[PDB]
Write a protein that binds this DNA or RNA. Sequence first.
RNA 1: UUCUGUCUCGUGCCUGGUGUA
DNA 2: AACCGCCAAGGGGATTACACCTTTTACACCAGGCACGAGACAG
Lengths: 362, 335, 116, 204, 67, 50, 62, 327, 123
Amino acid sequence: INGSEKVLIAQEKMATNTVYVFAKKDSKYAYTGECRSCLENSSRPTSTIWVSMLARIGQRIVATLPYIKQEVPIIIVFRALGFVSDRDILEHIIYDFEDPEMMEMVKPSLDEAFVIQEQNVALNFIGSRGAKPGVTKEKRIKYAKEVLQKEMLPHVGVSDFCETKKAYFLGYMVHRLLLAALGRRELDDRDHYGNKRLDLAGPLLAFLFRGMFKNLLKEVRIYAQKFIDRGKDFNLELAIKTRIISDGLKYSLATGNWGDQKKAHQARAGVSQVLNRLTFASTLSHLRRLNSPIGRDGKLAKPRQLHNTLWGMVCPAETPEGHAVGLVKNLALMAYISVGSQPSPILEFLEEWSMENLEEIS
Amino acid sequence: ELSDDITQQQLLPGVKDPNLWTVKCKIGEERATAISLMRKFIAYQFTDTPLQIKSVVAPEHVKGYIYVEAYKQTHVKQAIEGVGNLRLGYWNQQMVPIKEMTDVLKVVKANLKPKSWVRLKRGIYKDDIAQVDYVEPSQNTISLKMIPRIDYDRIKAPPQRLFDAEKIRSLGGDVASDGDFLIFEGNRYSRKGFLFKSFAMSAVITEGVKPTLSELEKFREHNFQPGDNVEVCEGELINLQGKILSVDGNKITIMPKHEDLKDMLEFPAQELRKYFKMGDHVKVIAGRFEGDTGLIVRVEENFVILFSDLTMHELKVLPRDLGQHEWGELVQLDP
Amino acid sequence: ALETVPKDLRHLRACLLCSLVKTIDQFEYDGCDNCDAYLQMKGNREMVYDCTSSSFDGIIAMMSPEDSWVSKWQRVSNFKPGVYAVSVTGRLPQGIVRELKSRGVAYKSRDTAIKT
Amino acid sequence: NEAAEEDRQLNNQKKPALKKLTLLPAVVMHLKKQDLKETFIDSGVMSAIKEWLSPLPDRSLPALKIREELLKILQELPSVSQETLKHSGIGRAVMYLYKHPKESRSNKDMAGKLINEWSRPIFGLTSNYKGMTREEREQRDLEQMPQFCARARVPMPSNKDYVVRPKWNVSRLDKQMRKFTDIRKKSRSAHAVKISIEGNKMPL
Amino acid sequence: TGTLETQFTCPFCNHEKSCDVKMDRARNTGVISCTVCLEEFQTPITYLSEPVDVYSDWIDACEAANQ
Amino acid sequence: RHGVNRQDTGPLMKCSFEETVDVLMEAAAHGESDPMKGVSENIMLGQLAP
Amino acid sequence: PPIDLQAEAQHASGEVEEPPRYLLKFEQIYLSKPTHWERDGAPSPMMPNEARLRNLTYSAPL
Amino acid sequence: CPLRTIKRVQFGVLSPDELKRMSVTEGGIKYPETTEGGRPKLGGLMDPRQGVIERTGRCQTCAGNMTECPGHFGHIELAKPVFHVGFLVKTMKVLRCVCFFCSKLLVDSNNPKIKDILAKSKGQPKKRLTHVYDLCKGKNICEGGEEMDNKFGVEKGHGGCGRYQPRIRRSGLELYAEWKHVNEDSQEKKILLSPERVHEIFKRISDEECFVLGMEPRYARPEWMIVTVLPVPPLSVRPAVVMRNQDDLTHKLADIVKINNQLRRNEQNGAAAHVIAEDVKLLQFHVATMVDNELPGLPRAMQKSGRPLKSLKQRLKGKEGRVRGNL
Amino acid sequence: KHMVDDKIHSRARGPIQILNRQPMEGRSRDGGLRFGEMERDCQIAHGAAQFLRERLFEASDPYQVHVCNLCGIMAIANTRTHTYECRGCRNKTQISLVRMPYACKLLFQELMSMSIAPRMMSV
RNA sequence: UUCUGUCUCGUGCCUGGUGUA
DNA sequence: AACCGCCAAGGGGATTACACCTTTTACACCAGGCACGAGACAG
Ligand SMILES: [Zn+2]
Ligand SMILES: [Zn+2]
Ligand SMILES: [Zn+2]
Ligand SMILES: [Zn+2]
């Protein structure tokens, strides 16, 4: 870039489309069934949901839906998806009714949601907390329907009728929260690398380019608007401001600030660094470097500790000894990072083997 | 014959009138918006959803908003919905309070009429006060009384002073004199020693002149500073002496000089006059001797006469007023 | 109807009897909508420039003059809906003001502005 | 009244009229007493204020402070009835200052708003929007009545003009919990004097 | 996302943040009153009901009545 | 800062450690004087400290 | 999201018009090799080392 | 001139009159611009009286070299007073101890408990205000309004105005007064407290009462906590780079001058009080961010360069600030 | 790569920063080593007050200002003609010169720009 | 009893990244 | 008209939620940023 050799450092982040039951002890929640959800390779930002159990007749389960200004009892979310009876809702959570220990734990949530039964009432309850106050009943309900369809758990699908799949996935997040609360299953570990993915130069650039391209279409919109409101014909060749991608990409790769220059102080810094050409082993290792987005000066040792899960993946010895100790990592000699592939071939093979589609099964 | 203002108080707005709501428009597109909002009103007035707005005010003195009058705020909105320059003032409109409504149609004194006083802004005529005598019915050009600032092509490879028609006729050029009437250098219309050439409307600014008495003779910001001794010369408190404390435009705060009055008093600067007593030491800060200093030797109602300390001359002054070389430079004096 | 709204916001002038704002060519071609039987400024420009002035401040687009406060304060309530000036400077010549008085129309100065 | 008359005598002698301006603080500090405003108005304060606002023999305006404070007081003295304004002439005395050329712009604004405030009642108008009743608005509202995407799209509030007003849509545990809370309080290792541990809220 | 609203614009006089909600949790009823035009509405509430639900019931009654 | 800024020491000494600006504003609003007797005050100025 | 533009109704006919709307859909993408154009527009393959020496940005047009 | 050592220093709020007197830029600073072309403006932000600007040049005010003259102060006469961030919390305390409408202290200085405070806090104003303020918490009426104090020739009551006091609340940078008990059915229960209204209130506080509030009028009179004359720092405090690129303070001052000009112009041509209120809302923001740009909630002031300005508080923030980083 | 010749650095009245007029930072800028707070505290513990004063005043940013004995505000001082005046007091005499570090002058000037009077009451 | 040397201490700044003890 | 009791308010106290400040010394280098669209007048 401008004659400077720049390397994109691989940025680790929590693995999307997966459920993690943590225990944020310093909060009003005994347990938190986090799930940060991301449609497909198809790009949009990841939206995250949290199915928590309050600390404290007690142990009520609440979901934090995207765009919904307040926590909603999960039983209301299931009624909103159309599962009105308590039996039907529990069928998506407590797969084996022969388990009194688990059922006794959902009663507090069925109790909290006793005053709401019909689907439209649950949809209204969610709507009034999502939509702005003056929205009509139809728009407010329809908006809650869209938030549940398109925003909650996008990886499950966003089509017109995914609500049954969504009921099963949300039920699974509650089931797993119950498992963790009962202690039948150990909590998830944030440092276990099976729960981490590395954003290499590809997903990093796709993250910028998505923004710039969306900006480029913003400019074609305002330019053509100026021409077509006057009844004239807007020439798109003038509407495309070439510079937005060119200088956009270039800028973030040059400074390392991974975001729009207008808001530079809000985006990540140092994602792109000047390649170290002092010695060949430094050049090679700089091209094989992993970075943890954890804020420096953090007192917590766990994110910096050599977790057992790094064996053979990350070098156990090569880390800076300064303030970045343990946050900056390096790939092991035979460590490969998957580039990714579409799941459709696998799904087709599974469907032809003896797999019941989730929508078909009792 | 009932006075005009008394017959006016009758029209004032009340709670029962349609409220005047501010909106927010793109600066300089307030008039184009208000008019386009007329076309919108006209287009909808016969359909199933006519616009519920009464009037749209776009004052000239304001720059940033038009105001929509409607009974209920949400009526203003349905009108401004989809209207582009008013897209910024869509989310909120502030009701101008019933007592701050009459002062929306307030106008304080366009002003392009003969026998008026105008000032120049661009060109060589920087900050120059002039007078308009006649306006052409075609309104293509306007006649003005002004004083030239050109050199006449001799300084090139100046202050304001009255024009004279004899020292100019010798430099050359196409000069045509027919007595008291002269024409020169691109129709420089002149009569009885005065120029009458016409000006361009973009270069002359009509408002913000407010002429002083000195202009009346061709065709009062005070020197007060904290610490000045003053005497009230006009109004209810005439002959009160006090010391200035603060100066804020033409508002002056003074500490009255009496054992019986300790509180601060504020007076407009027109109402005060400096005063001095024999033996005070003072500096002239304006006029013919500005920068000179000395002791006051005598005081008269008309003027103070002071003895310049170093140049040792008597020097008369008004009470209202009280680079060739560098330090260390070598100078010859005598040969 | 829209014949009364300014065609273009270039060369705008306000009638000086009723303060209605229209383009110079709109007055010249169609005349003033509110005041024609007492002034007779349709068909010439000499009368137009004598009575009608370009020096006006602010515009009020009057949509319902019958029902509006701004219309009352401004004495335009009995006029046709159109764009009006907030304040127009000037006075009629010493001919039509006399004719108007003779015809029973009390000419009151549209110069609403306060001086300094 | 004594102060204003003495200032008339002093003005004839072309001396500074200090008596009114010397009493002004004491007067302003009392006209502000809410419990006495009725007594003040009914005792003829409007007549005295008219005397103080009135121009002097040489037709000069009173001290700037007097106009500033008396105009501000009049704004804070709203109980004034029409007969009080008409009999005292305070209306004339303020309209005078509003027209007067030597009056400052802020005083002209105060006098202007006073004149509007005092004339509205004459025409039955009012400026307190919270003063119009509920039925008056409901009736007026009837009097004014006329003849794809990949993500959830945020709906926007209803702009509908609502005319019609809708009909309305219409312990044994805490005693034991209080007893247990009292037992908890009773168990505490309290002290008679709360010792300031870090010097905060140190007494005297 | 953000904090839930607790003051509302009177759907009749449109005066901003002029309406407040009193919640009588004992009689199971919410009462909303415009501190400007004094308009009021009352609706049955439940323990889940928040001020935003009352205001919505008011809007739903208005939107249903203004037809 | 909660303990030492509350000490009756001079505003400049306080200002030298945490909450530097607000303590100076506090002193200004209260017209507080600094005796110039500590090591820090004499060091802010170009004076031989005690 | 494909562009959908609808002109602001100017109401000049004095009636509610149906303003024209514009649709654009971005389709196939092509990317050429990294290319350097001299200031006169003459095309040349840009060598990384040239870029490194001349301070260019080794990029391809899209 | 005799050599001297600082035996003592004293802090105080700069009086607006003190500023206008010490300032060299007579008439205030009016022009946002620095140079009208080649030379610096005499009433702009690069006023040569306000210290020297070019190397090997001379200060007009003192003829000192670049390395010798201190920067001489200038001032901007604000059209409408504005609150001083950093004194706002303090103004709220004083404003809640004195009665609105008449500014008398809500607890008479003769009261026994106040006498106790004054007796026990001699030389400790900071502690004094804290204790008297704790007395003026449960006081929602200006007592003794029932009695005429001056007998007009015809134990002592408080002699107040009898008015119910507002409870003042802060919303970022704006102050609001709220009445729960109203004196008159016509009085509005909620008003925006303009800094001009608080200036009127502080001006009326007697010098005895403000000594009670722990503010010696000789050094920190309460109305001086409202910005009505803004001290423009000299060029030495905000020097311009040459390669002239202006400093963050010059840019903020340019904005303040621009709006100050626009605002006084809106007053002269009689714009409505609501235009002014929306404009003072901007002047207030800029004056506040010129001292503290780390203020909570409000949008941080940023140059279109894509970076936040570094205010006077930031210059003293802490590490790398004047005290820690340079003294 | 850590060769000593790329690290060896010495200074004796090199260039000065335009704002605080203190030795510049950095080796290429021909800067001076920072005499940090911990070093100040180490000299305080040593009781070497004259070395401490020299380091933090005489050898960093020595400066003189004229202060009004009546108000402690920095007065105008025209050394060319030896006329000194404190605008505000208008005394034009009864002024005194104080030796204070440039950063301290800087600070008292930043404090006036917040409307704080750090009155240098030398008398 | 034609002249003629006449040159002496200039300077970015912020932010971010990597590295040293 | 007097005294015993319940009712209301005062006020001081108690307990819970939101706002603010701080987060080790120095030292070297590097590279990037440093606002830009656009409209009105003069040889
Ligand atoms: Zn007409
Ligand atoms: Zn100087
Ligand atoms: Zn009071
Ligand atoms: Zn002094």
